Amino acid sequence: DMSHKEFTKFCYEVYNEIKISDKEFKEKRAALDTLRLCLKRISPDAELVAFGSLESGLALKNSDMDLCVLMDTIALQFYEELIAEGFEGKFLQRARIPIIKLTSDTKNGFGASFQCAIGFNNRLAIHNTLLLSSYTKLDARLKPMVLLVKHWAKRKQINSPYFGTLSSYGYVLMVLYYLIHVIKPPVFPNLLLSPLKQEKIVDGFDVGFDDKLEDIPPSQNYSSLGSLLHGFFRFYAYKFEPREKVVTFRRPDGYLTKQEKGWTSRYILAIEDPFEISHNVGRTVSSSGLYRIRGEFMAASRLLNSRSYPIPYDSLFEEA
Ligand SMILES: [Br-]
Ligand SMILES: [Br-]
Ligand SMILES: [Mg+2]
Ligand SMILES: [Mg+2]
């Protein structure tokens, strides 16, 4: 595939600038080690598990850590020890879903800008990280594609779940959906729908998937990174119908209506979590938020569709 050679070269240049460094990666590893030791002072029966982009390898520079304490009230004891240990942070006891947010470190050398969120017994988040991790190990093109889409969403201000747009995880799912169920030949098989997948029930949901990666043959898609991204932008700009359809990993042909799903009355953008199927990852998206997201997909597509010469690829990541 030599169709997008220039754009591809540019994609890999930006990727190398935005990906987390091995140094920052090692630092967050040491932070995790330190926090684990702190938790073991509270209880021998609790474990501290990393999830999210640092664990899957899909992290941008300066990303926050996402951690989960697994057990079986420890939250408050852990919080008190962490601050006694010189971390600074926030915690709301008895909260619906307790969360410790660490915002700084004063004694442990992890920096004044050390950011870490610690949840409790969130086994589902751990399993979707396992799934994302497997896909990143399956195809070398996935990691840069995800980072570039995340970087784009951030720069275009459409990566703000608290402000009516979409979480980073939401964009990752939109990427996987495209690579599995839209692009032909597929970049990836659907690991949940594999005939080798076995059911595994956690928290009332099936988190089973075909995880024996060595038995998965290499992709029959030979598209360059640039071609994959252009295709992804065009699908969500022009083809996907968010008023009617659900991004899903539970259908062999990837086809699912909001009607059938019963997601009709927030469901402005519908993205069904692959394990917690009752959760719409896009429920933070407002009507105005979706209009801006769609607008940005069209602009990205328009830029890349250009038959003119030298294309200003930089504008893809220029702010606003
Ligand atoms: Br993610
Ligand atoms: Br199209
Ligand atoms: Mg290449
Ligand atoms: Mg643009």
UniProtKB/Swiss-Prot annotation:
Changing residue 90 to A: Impairs binding to RNA. Also impairs binding to RNA. GO terms for biological process: negative regulation of nuclear-transcribed mRNA poly(A) tail shortening; polyuridylation-dependent decapping of nuclear-transcribed mRNA; RNA 3'-end processing. Disruption phenotype: Stabilizes urg1 transcripts. Its cofactor is Mg(2+); Mn(2+). Changing residue 101 to A: Reduces association with a 15-mer A stretch but does not affect association with a 15-mer U stretch. Changing residue 234 to A: Impairs binding to RNA. Also impairs binding to RNA. GO terms for molecular function: ATP binding; magnesium ion binding; poly(A) RNA polymerase activity; RNA binding; RNA uridylyltransferase activity; UTP binding. Its EC number is 2.7.7.19, 2.7.7.52. ATP binds at residue 283. UTP binds at residues 53, 125, 128-129, 150, 154, 168-169, 279. Mg(2+) binds at residues 64, 66. GO terms for cellular component: cytoplasm; cytosol. It is found in: Cytoplasm. Changing residue 275 to A: Reduces capacity for binding RNAs. Keywords: ATP-binding, Cytoplasm, Magnesium, Manganese, Metal-binding, Nucleotide-binding, Nucleotidyltransferase, Transferase. Changing residue 64 to A: Abolishes catalytic activity but does not affect RNA binding. Residues 224-279 form the PAP-associated domain. It catalyses: RNA(n) + UTP = RNA(n)-3'-uridine ribonucleotide + diphosphate; RNA(n) + ATP = RNA(n)-3'-adenine ribonucleotide + diphosphate. Belongs to the DNA polymerase type-B-like family. Cytoplasmic uridylyltransferase that mediates the terminal uridylation of mRNAs with short poly(A) tails such as such as act1, hcn1 and urg1 mRNAs, hence facilitating global mRNA decay. Uridylates the 3' ends of actin mRNAs upon S-phase arrest. Also has a weak poly(A) polymerase (PAP) activity. Residue His-279 is responsible for the specificity for UTP. Involved in cell cycle arrest where in association with crb2/rhp9 and chk1 it inhibits unscheduled mitosis. This is Terminal uridylyltransferase cid1. The lineage of its organism: Eukaryota, Fungi, Dikarya, Ascomycota, Taphrinomycotina.
